[model samples]
Target: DKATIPSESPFAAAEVADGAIVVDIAKMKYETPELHVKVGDTVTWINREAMPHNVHFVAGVLGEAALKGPMMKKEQAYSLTFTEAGTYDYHCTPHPFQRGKVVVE
Candidate 1:
């Protein structure tokens, strides 16, 4: 019954306590602290809800990479694999106040 069938209780979800940037879908905000990593680090923003969302930067951090995509639909996700070392400030397009920062150092 536990292995094959869908039960009434909500399925157990794994926590993103590892080290990546996480966004709480319900609160519509970044759950983890601002990330400061090297150039090879990959920054990911996970959509924790059913609604659609996206990622955008302020001015120079991501430059033209201002708009990612609708990421809150199921397994949808967005990642910015840092290539250059810079201080990047970004926010969700849907909710501008819900912001995040990445310092690739």
Candidate 2:
């Protein structure tokens, strides 16, 4: 099941910016599985659990510039700004079932 953005997310409370969206990586899933944002907005993923995690965009959608984030331990993060207007599907490289989406408008 998809999760809603949690109000108690440590990273969301600490690092939010004017045009930034924060997603927490905890319990082996993205806290918010689907997100909507405008072009040029930044999306940041923060690791909250002891197990490492990473974000890997689906091939072909972002093409050569697709995001392949590095493994992150607790408190570590990865940020990316969406420059195009389209739907992006992504998942954790080490956990294929952990999927998420970003719709840029």
Candidate 3:
């Protein structure tokens, strides 16, 4: 099938693929913009780049560390589950500029 669940991370693997959504971390920001997933759904981010990266919430406001970085590999993975319906903003702790959000409904 074309649609496969993401891994541990969210930015590195959240891309747009034919018949699926694929996030290629080899070229651009680790995470994309406004990732909307339903409650209990999952999102994964893979680190295709050489350096390490993570997917965190805005300024650590999500209670949890929200930071998952220094992937430093080709197959490293991370994922997040939106158990609640809200606009949660997150970014890579190492690279704040590489930011993203998840809206659960």
Candidate 3: RMSD to truth = 6.5
- The C-alpha stretches of model 2 lying farther than 4 A from their native spots are 1-18
Tell me which residue pairs clash in candidate 1: none
Clash pairs (backbone) in predicted model 2: none
lDDT values, one for every candidate: 0.55, 0.75, 0.55
Least well predicted 10-residue stretch by lDDT in candidate 1: 1-10
Cα displacement (angstroms), candidate 2, residue 20, comes to 2.4
**Per-residue lDDT of candidate 1, residues 48-80 (tens digit):** 676656666654446543444344454355555
Candidate 1 vs candidate 2, lDDT winner:
2
Q: What is the lDDT of residue 98 in candidate 3?
A: 76
Q: Taking the candidates one at a time, how many backbone clashes does each contain?
A: 0, 0, 19
Q: For residues 1-105, write the lDDT of model 2, one tens digit per residue.
A: 112222222333355566558888898999999999887777888888888888887557666555566777788766777778888899999899999988989
- Candidate 3 residue runs with Cα over 4 Å from true position: 1-23, 58-60, 64-72
TM-score of 3: 0.64
Task: Give the TM-score of each candidate.
Answer: 0.65, 0.79, 0.64
